[model samples]
Target: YKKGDDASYFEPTGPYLMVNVTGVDGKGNELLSPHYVEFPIKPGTTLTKEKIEYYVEWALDATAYKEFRVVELDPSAKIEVTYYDKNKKKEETKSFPITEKGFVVPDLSEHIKNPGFNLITKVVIEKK
Candidate 1:
């Protein structure tokens, strides 16, 4: 039998966490390009709603808009979204929650008075 050392074997360390942020319009059409951010995470680390939201905030901090945040609601978590309801109109706020499957910003056509351009933010997570 021949043996060197347990550390002799080259074992690659991995298993990172990935968070995805995407956007869409009222008609389910794509809006802003999808944004993704990933970081190394230790094993057995469970990401709670708040923790996931933290990562989301971190991701948004690097983007053009830093006003995004995850708000905890009765049923699920939501991201506060703001946009115009019509041309040259004032901005409005909408609560879009992160569902069990993922997170989504409600369609503007359903809530907006005049139904102007809107961005729907969808949040998703993955293991890399």
Candidate 2:
């Protein structure tokens, strides 16, 4: 069941969101990318950048991947983190803070006991 109104397609509008990925080490050393990552967005409105696919490919050995444990979020972005807890034996959703040089990606090996696993599924970056 459905109803029709004026039947005119209108452009969605809003302030777009952008993400900046930077690898960090144990001592808060930054391995920032050469350029920032931003989606195709206009000036300003009320649109949000929903969940999207992004490829982050980098060398491990060449960049001291062992030292680089987690990634740091920029401008205190909100991350919808989802992870499994073998100890607690359940999965849950929670709000995490992006502290100054704080961890964005929790260590899958240490926290979830799954090395190289993806924990984060949803990312909503607001335009600053």
Candidate 3:
């Protein structure tokens, strides 16, 4: 990722992904509005442990900043899964680092199970 360039900010570094949520009313209309957070890295980083720690810290700060009141799902709404050969394992999971930008949530299939409940937000990530 290059510094001070449009494309630079486009690509994300490390193994982390981002997720954002948009609360809806009973009628499936927008309510609490959209929110965002950065999940910790699942793998692929020279400073894996340290970066994870920092990501956690950042997530905590983000959650508090956004004043999110949703209950955290089990295992966690955000997570990092690792694979060893054909075997896959969950490495770390967290629910923090809420932000207005700098992350993207690839898919929400696991988190929100309700088919009627629609996700009303945008998520994007840059390739590095």
Q: Pick the candidate with the highest TM-score.
A: 1
What's the lDDT for residue 14 in model 2? 21
Cα lDDT tens digits for candidate 1, 1-111: 322222222321333334456633334444336676544444344444556557666666667645545442223334454556576578777553445444432345443
Count the clashes in each prediction: 0, 5, 4
Q: Which scores higher on lDDT, 1 or 2?
A: 1
lDDT of 3 at 65: 32
Off by over 4 Å in 3: 1-8, 25-29, 32-34, 42-65, 72-128
Give, for candidate 1, the lowest lDDT window spanning 10 residues: 3-12
Lowest lDDT 10-residue stretch of candidate 3:
113-122
Q: Per TM-score, what order, best first?
A: 1, 3, 2
The digit string of per-residue lDDT tens for model 2 on 1-128 reads 32223222432122122333445444545444332332322222222212222222212223333233223233444444356666787886555443334333344443433222222222222212
- Whole-model lDDT values for every prediction: 0.45, 0.33, 0.32
Candidate with better lDDT, 2 vs 3 = 2
Global local distance difference test of model 3:
0.32
Candidate 2 stretches with Cα past 4 Å from truth are 1-76, 99-101, 110-128
Worst 10 residues of 2 by lDDT: 49-58
